[PDB]
DNA sequence: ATTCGCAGTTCGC
DNA sequence: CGCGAACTGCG
């Protein structure tokens, strides 16, 4: 089973390595064979002498083409002649590739921007993470001294904690009597001692919660001031840090550093990423925080250490957790992209899409298109129409059938040949057209993504079929996560077309797919209107909320029942409209914003402030409350008896601060804000103190009782104390309640003066 | 660094 | 003032 790749120097030759675990044993793989490359476009073939002298300089000595080959590509389906273009070391080419395409006779270069091994994976055909090889992880976190603003690692690291299938342990250099703590006599021996342990356990995979950013930074820093070899890598090497974009990556060579805080924000949407939330919300048990702040002061007075300790062991204890639940879905995510867990777990959606294209296309003799320069780019900044969402009848309703198609817009990208290969492609004797954008696809071939998209789709019934039969609980959980990540990664090829900065982009092709989408649920919601008497309440982009206003609720199943098959007979090829489910009732307060419970008694929500991150708890909770009453009995007074309660309780200071909580997500660097509400006032304090704040960066912040705009009297909700702060029940009467319930109850006539 | 469509709050002028 | 720009997070 293949971890990574990379490549070292060996006299000025590349050498790729190859990480496996092959029956338990780690394994190193080298090839020096493999020869960087990339394609060359011309006018004349006689003009590849003139581009055989080039040269270019990169570490004293020139750097020349080496080699050079005249090969067929195909190129968006379509017959294309390039030469390769062969070098020594694959740091040739960003010495020398601009000066290829500067020159006259060079229309263009192509495949120059695949790093050598991701592009080794690709050529060989090698595919990571495959088999049922046992991996060994281990979870680490450290606890550090925290002060004002001293800069960053000032501080000593106080304990390591590290936690596996043997148990969560912890090293620390001062006395605390607990059985799980390793006692040491300086920082040094603690790091020294933590080596220790990793070089024996030997791991595959080391798991952190943001070590891409702060426990790997942090350890440096220390061991450069102590002089202290980090070598946790399996060669020896010590971490390497790797920017992206802002943030920061690191690896450690012959393992697997998988950091779990980007896939759990890519993963989950919750309003805060706090390794005590991200806990709880997916084991559903509460883990306890203990603060810089009362870190420090255990510290420094020696009292309370105990409480330090235990924190230090649950941090690493539920990282270790949290690997195991989250590194299977990432082992198939790296299967399926065919690149390693290190660089997939860090990838973007529109980056994931990206890799299996190349690899494919490779696959194909498919010539790949560049990524936009900076000027094609700007052209891209056009947008088309999107979804469809109806003017909904707002109100109260009863025994709904929500319909939704079955993978919309992927079916549309197969059913319809959706690709730049086939727009347009004159000569063809079968096309099909595209409402109101007009586009025609060629349907005499299958089209470069529709392929991949139809082989994926095949690839997915197939793995349910197989999982259903199978009684191993091994292979089918490995196919469950296989067949789970195939139907994420087919619904992220319409959003990619649209993609300013895809390879494959195709804005013809994003809107043609929202043209059909939109026909399609309008021609629907006409159809089951007219044909059949209903009266549809909500419909939003692939499916709708309908009725018969007054039926048996077996009469309104029945009729969407007999209702499906009349349309899907209509329906061409891979479009599909499905039965979702029966609900008992459902209110809906405008576009976007609804909610509806099933026959069982289960609430759902969307849209509403319930979900959003940017509402404290008061007001989520008390939405849902009025939501569950009439919802489960329909009871009116009960809504408003509900809301009363909370606003007196709101008056009389009773309720808790940790329901009155506001997270906003930092966009970008604060410097920048024209408009600086709330959430940034507090960043910007913040800035300006020790503390560092970064693109997605989430701020809870509280009101105080105060007047004039919000964001002077807002706080941290961090530094809120209730002997030196109060809240503003105002604010939250006004700006949070009485706003969210109203609207709902701007229904039975409710007036907000009826509330409070 | 997937797309667009949209509700809704804070804040300046 | 009332409005509109700025901003956020949602499906
Ligand atoms: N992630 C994303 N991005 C952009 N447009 C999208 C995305 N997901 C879904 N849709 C489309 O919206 C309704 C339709 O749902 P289908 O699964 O039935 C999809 O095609
Ligand atoms: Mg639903």
Known sequence: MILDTDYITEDGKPVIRIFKKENGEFKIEYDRTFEPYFYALLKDDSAIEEVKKITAERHGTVVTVKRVEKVQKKF???????????????????????????????????????????????????????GDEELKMLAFAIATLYHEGEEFAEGPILMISYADEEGARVITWKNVDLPYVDVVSTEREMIKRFLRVVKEKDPDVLITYNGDNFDFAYLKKRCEKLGINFALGRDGSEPKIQRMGDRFAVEVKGR????????????????????????????????????????????????????????????????????????????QLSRLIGQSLW?????????????????????????????????????????????????????????????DFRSLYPSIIITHNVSPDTLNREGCKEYDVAPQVGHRFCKDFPGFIPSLLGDLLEERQKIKKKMKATIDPIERKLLDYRQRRIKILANSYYGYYGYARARWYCKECAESVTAWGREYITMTIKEIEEKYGFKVIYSDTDGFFATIPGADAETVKKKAM????????????????????????????????????????????????????????????????????LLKDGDVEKAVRIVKEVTEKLSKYEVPPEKLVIHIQITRDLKDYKATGPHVAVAKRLAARGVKIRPGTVISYIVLKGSGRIGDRAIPFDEFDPTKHKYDAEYYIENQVLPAVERILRAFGYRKEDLR
């Open 562 to 629: 007999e209702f499906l098959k009349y349309i899907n007979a209509k329906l061409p090829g891979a479009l599909e409209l499905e039965y979702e489910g029966f609900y008992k009732r459902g209110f809906f307060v405008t576009k976007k914003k609804y909610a509806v419970i099933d026959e069982e008694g289960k609430i759902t929500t969307r849209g509403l402030e319930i979900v959003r991150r940017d509402w404290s708890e008061i007001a989520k909770e008390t939405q849902a409350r009025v939501l569950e009453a």
């Open 256 to 331: 697997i550093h998988f950091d779990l805080y980007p896939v759990i924000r890519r993963t989950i949407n919750l309003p805060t990423y706090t390794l005590e939330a991200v806990y709880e919300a997916v084991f559903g048990q509460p883990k306890e925080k203990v603060y810089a702040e009362e870190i420090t002061t255990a510290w420094e007075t020696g009292e309370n250490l105990e409480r330090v300790a235990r924190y230090s062991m649950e941090d690493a204890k539920v990282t270790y957790e949290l690997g195991k639940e989250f590194l299977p879905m990432e082992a």
């Open 76 to 130: 968006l389906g379509r017959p294309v002649e390039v030469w390769k273009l062969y070098f020594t070391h694959p740091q040739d080419v960003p010495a020398i590739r601009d000066k290829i395409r500067e020159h006259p006779a060079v229309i263009d270069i192509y495949e120059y921007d695949i790093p050598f091994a991701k592009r080794y994976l690709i050529d060989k055909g090698l595919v990571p993470m495959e």
């Open 343 to 403: 660089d997939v777990s860090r990838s973007s959606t529109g980056n994931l899409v990206e890799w299996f294209l190349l690899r494919k296309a490779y696959e194909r003799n498919e010539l790949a298109p560049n990524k936009p320069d900076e000027k094609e780019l700007a052209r891209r900044r056009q947008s088309y129409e999107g979804g469809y969402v109806k003017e909904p009848e707002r109100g109260l309703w009863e025994n709904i059938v929500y319909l």
